[PDB]
């Protein structure tokens, strides 16, 4: 195995993937990215979670259970579809206060927290579609809470990008220099051609030396045929890209197909 970093699994895209406690007991991951939070902004009023229909009632106690085993839990916002954006600089503030008080370490008296007293360790900027709408102001607003934290990353700010640099819809927030991790997807619209995967990842790595840059791969060819790499091939590519100083590990889409194929097991 050539993965010198983290192993991130993405959760909440198929009902039959099992629980969240299930993934943290598999002994194969270090970080779980909860997915998604579909709609926000366009509509100033309601903020739409979408995890394709999971028993949302137990994610909270599951979030706390993994942190007891050293796992780190991330909330992914956006996705592919669902009508998300931040039209006005006001929409980013309301989205911020939604994240801080409903999921993160903040507390109100009248807000509902789907995850109970458990706190999500950070927000992942899975901004696939939309425009360049006000995520940089949202990034600075989320990062600011870290001044109350000692000897840890209290609120981690990560992003999930296109394969080709630059991502037109995330280059705004990435310029802030506030993103701890960057997951470079090899497997969705903006696919890298196999002959330009290594060159594209190395460009992302060299551009953001103060962010841990991870490679996003699929666990089965059913997700993306022209982007799938069998574990043996991925280990060969890792042997080259892990020589980057800020290589952070691998992110696998998703928990559903990683169960079927056992991709991360053979890696």
């Amino acid at each position: 195995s050539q993965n010198t970093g983290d192993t991130v699994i993405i959760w909440g895209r198929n009902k039959d993937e099992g629980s969240l406690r299930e993934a943290c007991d598999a002994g194969r991951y270090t970080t779980v990215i909860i997915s998604f939070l579909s709609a926000f902004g366009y509509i100033p009023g309601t903020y739409k979670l979408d995890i394709s229909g999971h028993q949302v009632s137990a994610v909270g106690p599951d979030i706390k259970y993994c942190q007891s085993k050293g796992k780190l839990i991330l909330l992914a916002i956006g996705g592919q579809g669902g009508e998300y954006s931040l039209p006005s600089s006001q929409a980013a503030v309301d989205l911020h206060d939604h994240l801080w008080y409903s999921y993160l370490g903040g507390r109100r008296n009248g807000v509902y927290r789907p995850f109970g007293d458990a706190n999500v360790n950070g927000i992942d900027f899975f901004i696939d579609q939309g425009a360049r709408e006000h995520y940089n102001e949202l990034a600075k607003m989320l990062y600011d809470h870290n001044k109350d934290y000692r000897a840890t990353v209290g609120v981690m700010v990560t992003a999930t990008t296109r394969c080709g640099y630059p991502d037109h819809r995330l280059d705004e927030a990435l310029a802030t220099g506030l993103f701890h991790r960057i997951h470079v997807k090899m497997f969705s619209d903006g696919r890298c051609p196999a002959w330009s995967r290594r060159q594209s990842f190395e460009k992302w790595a060299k551009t953001y030396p103060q962010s841990r840059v991870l490679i996003g791969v699929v666990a089965s060819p059913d997700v993306d045929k022209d982007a799938y790499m069998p574990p043996e091939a991925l280990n060969n590519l890792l042997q080259f890209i892990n020589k980057q100083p800020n290589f952070g590990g691998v992110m696998v889409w998703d928990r559903f197909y990683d169960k079927k194929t056992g991709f991360t097991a053979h890696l």
């Binding site: 270090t30 085993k69 050293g70 370490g105 001044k147 109350d148 000692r150 000897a151 840890t152």
Partner: protein, 192 residues
């Protein structure tokens, strides 16, 4: 050798959990190495913690070895956090030109892994920590002789603390921490 980590990061590297945190002051550079080795170089730092270890603490034995050369206030210690109760614990094996013992409540004396430690406790009120601003206690085990390599039977120190009313909660993380405060220097530690 010019590439390094200078902003807060946390994750795993070569099987080991690692954490680097700084308040931004001065210039601090951290680097992960093979296996459980890390190094750090700082100049006129503000406050920082750094080290490799385990993403979930336990009463495990901890092996450390390397070089620790501070020019000012700096600590080298087994270090970690527990929740409910919120605890920040130090098992200091080496330090620079400052000893925080004389400003803390001396509470006992334990002997483990070849020397006698002075045990202290101290309360932090509305101070930053791993779950935000909060109130918590600091448990300290400070070695009387300063070594740069050895084993740490954390079960021993955890026993004397619980013996003295200093109980730990659910372990959070556990590392060999090179911590600096308004100082300069360099450190290269291997953790196992």
């Amino acid at each position: 050798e010019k590439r390094a980590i200078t902003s807060n990061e946390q994750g795993t590297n070569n099987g080991y959990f690692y954490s680097f945190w700084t308040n931004g002051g001065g210039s601090v550079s951290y680097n992960n190495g093979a296996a459980g080795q890390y190094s750090v170089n700082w100049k006129d730092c503000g406050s920082f913690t750094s080290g490799k270890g385990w993403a979930t603490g336990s009463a495990r034995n901890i092996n450390f070895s390397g070089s620790f050369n501070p020019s000012g206030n700096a600590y080298l210690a087994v270090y970690g956090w527990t929740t409910s109760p919120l605890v920040e614990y130090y098992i200091m094996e080496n330090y620079g030109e400052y000893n925080p013992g004389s400003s803390m409540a001396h509470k006992g004396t334990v002997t483990s892994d070849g020397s006698v430690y002075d045990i202290y406790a101290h309360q932090q009120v509305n101070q930053p920590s791993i779950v935000g601003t909060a109130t918590f206690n600091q448990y300290w085990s400070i070695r009387r002789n300063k070594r740069s390599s050895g084993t740490v039977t954390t079960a021993n120190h955890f026993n004397a603390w619980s013996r003295l009313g200093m109980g730990l909660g659910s372990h959070n993380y556990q590392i060999v921490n090179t911590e600096g405060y308004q100082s300069s220097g360099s450190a290269s530690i291997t953790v196992s």
